[PDB]
């Protein structure tokens, strides 16, 4: 019973707004065409499902800064994914478009929450592979960030990846030049792009040459500590990049606001 459990509303992006009829819970209803699925996986029930369902179930456990898969259905030519929908919400890309470069205090709270969410993915054996502002939702009342769209993700592994379908302008130079990368250091590079995006108002690189060029020009006033963290995340050599622990111990990352403080100071 698919159309009997949810009242489907309007398009959000093929993702529809919906409300769970059981308890009027706001949901997002994501449709995925079978004929367009890159990587397939298998759940415990032996069922062959898109990798996105596998990854979403692995990170679904408990509370997190990750979108929760509440349910899914299979149809003749598609899978349908029932995701939680924060309300009110705005994705981080629209938020930065509207606000310009974020005050460092707000960028620190946001970036910290993205770090916690990505650590959560890695703890659960999941590599997102498409961290970017478009894939981050802001719950505007709670001040909490939610990572979305695992459509490009993989099982986390320590060996080299030679496939990639994420966003190119967030991908690291070793992917650009040699079409290979390791998961964690590639993630860290995309987090550097993301952090620059928050404090400068847009991503630093648009072309391959800039990506592999390893030069970071700051178009906005940014503190030396924040510039240092960004430049560290965007080290050309992957082994030169900080671990997640080194990012969160960085001096710029200290004294983060709580989510609710973040909402009250910056979002209400």
């Amino acid at each position: 019973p698919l159309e009997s459990q949810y009242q489907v509303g309007p398009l959000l992006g093929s993702v529809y707004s919906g409300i769970r009829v059981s308890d009027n819970l706001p949901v997002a209803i994501k449709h995925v065409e079978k004929d367009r699925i890159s990587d397939w996986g298998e759940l415990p029930n032996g069922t062959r499902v898109p990798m996105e369902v596998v990854l979403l179930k692995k990170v679904s456990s408990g509370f997190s800064g990750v979108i929760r898969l509440l349910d899914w259905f299979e149809r003749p030519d598609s899978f349908v994914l029932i995701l939680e929908r924060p309300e009110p919400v705005q994705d981080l890309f629209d938020f930065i478009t509207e606000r310009g470069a974020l005050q460092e205090e707000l960028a620190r709270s946001f970036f910290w929450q993205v770090l916690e969410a990505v650590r959560h993915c890695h703890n659960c054996g999941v590599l997102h592979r498409d961290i970017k502002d478009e894939n981050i939702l802001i719950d505007l009342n709670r001040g909490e960030l939610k990572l979305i769209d695992f459509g490009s993700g993989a099982l986390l592994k320590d060996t080299v990846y030679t496939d990639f379908d994420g966003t190119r302008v967030y991908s690291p130079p070793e992917w650009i030049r040699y079409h290979r990368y390791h998961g964690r250091s590639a993630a860290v590079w995309s987090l550097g792009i993301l952090l620059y995006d928050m404090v400068c108002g847009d991503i630093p690189f648009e072309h391959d040459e800039e990506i592999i060029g390893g030069q970071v020009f700051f178009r906005q006033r940014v503190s030396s500590e924040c510039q240092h963290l960004i430049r560290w995340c965007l080290a050309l050599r992957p082994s030169d990049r900080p671990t997640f622990e080194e990012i969160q111990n960085h001096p710029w990352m200290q004294d983060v606001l709580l989510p609710q403080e973040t909402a009250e100071i910056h979002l209400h």
Partner: peptide
Amino acid sequence: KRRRHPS
């Protein structure tokens, strides 16, 4: 100009 980037 700031723009989105598909995957």
